[model samples]
Target: GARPTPLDSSATWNDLAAMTDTARNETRLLPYFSHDMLQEEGSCCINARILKYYVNHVLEHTDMKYPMIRNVREGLHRVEQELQNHCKHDYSSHPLVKQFKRNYHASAIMDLAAARNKAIGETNTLYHYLFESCTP
Candidate 1:
């Protein structure tokens, strides 16, 4: 069975604001999951699968933020580590790993790039909309 996606997709500004708190609280759980993945032999694949689910879900839910970018970075690291452990070498140089890494890296970079642009636009929208109604 496919693993379920993370709930990060359900995020809002409220969600991004609470990420540090959530991540802090969840740190304990990370080790357990990470270790389980290492032992299971398919953890890297699982990580990529989970991330794909998250990017689409969260990116479309609301506005973007820096934390989402950071999350993507961190998530990619986990995936990379899992693949390295599986391959028992530097998967970063491996073609298969390289392709996967590209996807993961792109996800994070694209998220932040889009977020930075969106936040600026949102700021302008909010400023004008705050005092008066406007049409785009």
Candidate 2:
């Protein structure tokens, strides 16, 4: 029951298709995050719970061909631990704290997506550079 909109024009559809393979392959090299994992579900107190769920799901579903599963899992665990620590610290008086206090849980999750994408881009660039340097 989904309707096509102007955003789904021929050019956009072609571009999306062209990029699909690259996106799929990128997941194999870098850490992957589901969109649901980057948002707070309902009004949960734990802001990073969704992220934890996503990380665990990805790890559980990772196939044998994938490398660095241990490293990725460790990194995700560390991130979740840090998020818990951060939440425990009260920042009621700090600058910009008030702005985020009311929406900390939701905002932090959104910020996670931006941070994840940044890391993924950096990782991809590093891999590209390495591949290019090795090719010559």
Candidate number of the best TM-score: 2
In the predicted model 1, the residue pairs found to clash are: none
lDDT of 2 by residue, 7-103 (tens): 2234433433333333345513222223443232221113234334435543332323334444544544554455445455443343332333334
Cα lDDT listed for each candidate = 0.35, 0.34
Cα TM-score per model: 0.27, 0.31
Residue 98 accuracy (lDDT) in model 1: 49
In model 2, which residue pairs have backbone atoms overlapping below 3 Å?
Answer: none
Q: Which residue ranges in model 2 land beyond 4 Å of their true spot? A: 1-23, 26-47, 61-63, 88-136
User: lDDT, candidate 1, residue 91?
Assistant: 27
User: Which 10-residue span in candidate 1 carries the lowest summed lDDT?
Assistant: 127-136
lDDT of 1 at 109: 74
Provide C-alpha RMSD values for all models, in order: 17.1, 17.5
Model 1's TM-score against the true structure: 0.27
